[PDB]
Subunit: 312 residues, 5 copies
Amino acid sequence: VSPPPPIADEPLTVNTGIYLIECYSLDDKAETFKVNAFLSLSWKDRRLAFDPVRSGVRVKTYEPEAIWIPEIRFVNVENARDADVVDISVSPDGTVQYLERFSARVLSPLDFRRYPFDSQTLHIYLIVRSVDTRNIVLAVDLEKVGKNDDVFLTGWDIESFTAVVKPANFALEDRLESKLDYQLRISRQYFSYIPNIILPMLFILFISWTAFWSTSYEANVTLVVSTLIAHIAFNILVETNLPKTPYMTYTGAIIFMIYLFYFVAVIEVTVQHYLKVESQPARAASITRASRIAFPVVFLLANIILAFLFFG
Amino acid sequence: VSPPPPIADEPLTVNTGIYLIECYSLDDKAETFKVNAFLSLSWKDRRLAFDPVRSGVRVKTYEPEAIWIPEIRFVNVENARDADVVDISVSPDGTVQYLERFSARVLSPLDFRRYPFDSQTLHIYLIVRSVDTRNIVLAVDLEKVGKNDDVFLTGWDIESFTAVVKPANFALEDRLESKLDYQLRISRQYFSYIPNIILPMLFILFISWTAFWSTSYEANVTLVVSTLIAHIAFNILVETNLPKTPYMTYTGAIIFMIYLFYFVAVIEVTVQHYLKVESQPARAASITRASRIAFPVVFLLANIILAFLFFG
Amino acid sequence: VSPPPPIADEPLTVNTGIYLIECYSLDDKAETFKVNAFLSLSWKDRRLAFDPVRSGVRVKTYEPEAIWIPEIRFVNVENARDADVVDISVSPDGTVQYLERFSARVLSPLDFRRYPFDSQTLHIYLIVRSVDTRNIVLAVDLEKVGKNDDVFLTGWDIESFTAVVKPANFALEDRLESKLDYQLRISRQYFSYIPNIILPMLFILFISWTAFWSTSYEANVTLVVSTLIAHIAFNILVETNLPKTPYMTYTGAIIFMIYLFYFVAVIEVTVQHYLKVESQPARAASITRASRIAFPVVFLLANIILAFLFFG
Amino acid sequence: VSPPPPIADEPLTVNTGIYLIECYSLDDKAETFKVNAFLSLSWKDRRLAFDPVRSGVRVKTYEPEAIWIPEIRFVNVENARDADVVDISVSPDGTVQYLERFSARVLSPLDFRRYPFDSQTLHIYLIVRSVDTRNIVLAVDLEKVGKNDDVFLTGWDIESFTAVVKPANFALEDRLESKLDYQLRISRQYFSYIPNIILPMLFILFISWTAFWSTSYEANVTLVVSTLIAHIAFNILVETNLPKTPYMTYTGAIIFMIYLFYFVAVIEVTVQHYLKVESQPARAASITRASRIAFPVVFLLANIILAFLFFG
Amino acid sequence: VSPPPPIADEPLTVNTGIYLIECYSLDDKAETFKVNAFLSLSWKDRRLAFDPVRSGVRVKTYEPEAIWIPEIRFVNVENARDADVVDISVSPDGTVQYLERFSARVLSPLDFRRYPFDSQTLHIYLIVRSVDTRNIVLAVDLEKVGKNDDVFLTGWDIESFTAVVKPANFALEDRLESKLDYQLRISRQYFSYIPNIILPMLFILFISWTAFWSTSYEANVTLVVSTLIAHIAFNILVETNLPKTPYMTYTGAIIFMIYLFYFVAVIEVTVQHYLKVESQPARAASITRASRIAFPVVFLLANIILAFLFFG
């Protein structure tokens, strides 16, 4: 039908609010996730009001087809949402209440630069279609914004869920004042990563570092190269969960540094054996005794530098 | 169509019932499962009443779009259920019989705190929103709740499928709702895990422990490091199908313990070689003879303590 | 658009029939398969007795709409079939002819007790629900049951496709239903499994056994442990196919036996070295010479016993 | 609206034609691929004609729904094609032009017996629905068949695309029916296999064959067994892109040959060491000298014999 | 419902334009990328021009249907787009404004000759069919073609999104069609590839090379073969991504060169041992002294030549 008359001079306001029910399947490679929530809606329409004389219930219902309901669209969704109209009730004072239940698939960016200890924010954008007669603006009601007690994400924990009235849509066609942003702040659960990833890597490195206490060339070669193979194998477990990020990461820096340390250890073993063959054992002993202390200290300093760089 | 006439003394009640046909596709990483089942409803409409007189022996059977059907939805589903109506019958007394068949995908948490020998409970929720004229509450028909004898799940065995008879009424978004709970208790079939996982790891550990009866350095190093690599590969296989958790599991604790044991064995081999080279063979012999007994006993005690801690 | 009236109390019969066109995508882990075929029906409706003498000359052909067609469903399917009607024709006496083409994904359990050389049976179930005013039964018409010679399953031999004539009538949800069973017997092609799996395993086992002719500890350790690692990798490649089962299969038994043999070989090598160190070469020589004959004989005996146990 | 009257002496002939647009997703596990093309029909109907007088300048006419259109359905398709009519024109004589555009999934067998150097043939089948009034027989049209130069399949090159008639001696259809065959010939480009999968394996085998130029038992054992492990790893790599096939293959024969050669090499090394320890060095030298020449010649001859057994 | 009538012989032109919103899921093996964007159309239709003075309106809209809208279809898509009309508006002179929102999966070939540092161009094609006697041609509105500044793709740098203004007219199926081309130019981000793939490979190669400063045969064999195994594992990791291409890429050539280098290193070690055994230490010393310098220089020259060949 027709929109409400613009006889009222003030712009038409459509209050809004989303109530989350569940969020699931947050893919990391395509950075896409799904939602299932309640979409509430309300606006004032003085054209179709109600008087208490008809009945004392003070409540009347209507149909989706007979009453003009403004069209609200989602910006970043793969496909249009699935609408299931629930209930509408018209107060005697003209205010209407509109409900819907929808499910969607949302595209949002993710920043994996502190991958084990990162926090992400997921956005949902709302726009409206301007009507010919009057002016349509949006608003947020803090009462209709919330999340259920049974919202869970596998591996994450939800922190909060708010909204803003930002009318700052990128200018395309007369919609540069009719946007809305909903923010979902989440954090990753990182405790399981310690005993599953970090400590075995340190154990393998320390195993390979025992070559500085022996002078047998064959045993040193076996130790170092076999531990290198074990490190390459452990990279497979490191990779089977972490995404295929085409950019720098904390874990990537750690792995590259580990490769560098293995190379330097091989060089040290080679030079020690070569010096010992040339009837210069004192220099070889001095070099290996220096390396015994040099290696862990440099490893710890590089760890500290990297941690300060990425988290500060 | 309009709701049944408000008798102004009692809210409308609806008696539900779910009959399982088969369950399948219990995803472990996403904690989902798929269902196929019946759904039968029943309530009282004061109208549509007719006596058996005037050829009324044939009970009436209307069609959708001609009567009033309550909207009943599942809370924890990815998408709205795909359903098709089977039969609708109206008794001469005034009640109505309703049947339906649906398929759906359900989200439910899982608890892998005892992962090889765990038990899980799965939930299905039914909700209904009170209309603007009449209140609606739910009920349970205990003779229409059950499962086929042919309901099989791959990897699990089914124990019970009941329904809690007490709805949890509450008010949400300025309207009153009633929620039902269905519980499907299952247990895991753990027989396949023993000879495929547990025994080979024990064999590999016992193989790596043979280095205490030897005295050559190269053979000891080869044995221990190669067995460590084999353990890493078995860890690959084990963790290929186990989701990450915020708590500490059983298998993760055991795997970390075995990593610690390998590290300590490497340390002991290095110490023995270093002592032997420095011309103190008696001390090295005493150390290795002590370790021969010390290792299995400590392993046994640690395993027993862990089993008591988790399953106590 | 209403069920035909019975004469006095007799029920109505429908003669079904399925003609396979192609089977594909047989999953072991999911225990499903796909199929598309023809569904043929025929029943009696005497409200439409055609008279060719005066009212027309040719028998009537109808359209899917505005004609009473029995509802037919499949019990063990994930979702409802996607069927397109082909033709409906009415004979002068009153018997209706019907055809349609459909597809679905069928669920049926499998048996893996003889996995390399196992034979399976697959079931498809039809059903129909009795209306209040009429009772409906099902029947088989053997002239429309069959399969195309082009029906090919990748990796299986199709033997027969028959139906059990006698239905199974039962009362479910306070109504009478009838059920039909279609059995499709298939057998696995096992020749590809011999060179791909069986023989490399034997070659690696013999390579491991070749260590009883050597007297060097380092070489024996290298041989046995490297062959164990190769066996672990091949076990991973094999196990990527067979799902976990509550019972014990054949391949699992053979793999466990091979692990046992590896453990015993390691123990033998360790004992031989330990005895040789103590200046008792006679005992070590006797032990290794006895093992040279003991190992293959026991392997052969164990394999024969297992083959008799599982296939007898 | 009505089938054409059987007025002409010969039955009703339709001129068909398929014009490919692009192809993609040639899945090999399911032996299926998707298509996108045009479907142009043509038939004659003297019943309605547009004589060139009385404003008969309109050569063609547009009849979307008030005209008879034969039902053309595919045979080997998972689901019904997604077709939408493009153009409908009626010539003044009576010949009718028809045209659509469809997308579908095809099920055609694949044969990987010469996998690196194989060729395939993909079939698409067309059948027509008979009508009691007039007989309908399919007929190809040479000018309406073809394909774009913009078709492409990843890893394949297209040789030809033609059509031929094929009587339908199948489907047990009690009515007379006709079928059409469309054949697409594709040859795989094998160039990217010689430097990717073949030559590295030759290099690994030749590396393993250098154990015949040494007398050190430990070095020979390490060489041969580590190269066997490398062969297993390369087999794991190769398994990435090959199909999971249930029959014999050329590549499988090559892999089995390589395993056999590794076994024989280990046996030779053991024999040489056993003879050398037994104070018979001349025999060991003779055996090694024989092996140096024997191994490559036998490998080449067996490869020639396998290449003759296949490919002919 | 009817195409606009021509004046005498002139054709009808429609002005198009695509405003990008977001691109994602750029599959390299399948060579597809999903997309969703605004689509705009505009054309002149004088059969429904109005009088602004009498009607009292300055813009006139219509329902989504009940007006003649040209059929615009994409050529290289897997299926028809998921259209969503947003607005139809008309100008007083007769021009029709139009909007639409869609999403689709496109097909486009790629070039992988410079895979780490390559740039690609993606194509979107639009076509229209000539209905009636009114020829239809396309045109580009330069102020509507654009891209959102938030259009992002993971790992790619987006340079431009332009269109070729001149269409291409050709006769398909004895009918004329006009085609437009939309080009999206992107370049790959290569920084993450260097520390992930390039440098570990070099470190492993240098670890292999360190064997020219040694004399012990067992240590050299262990070093070279273990580094070869690690190289095979990294080959697995890299081959996970790249598809099969009929031509030779940069990475494939580099990998083959590395394989050849490993083979030559094994040969050199073998010949050094063979010469030293025959009591000729001087020749072996000279050979190894030469090889120490010879290997890195040859590697550098080969890399330089490859870089000049593929980029010159």
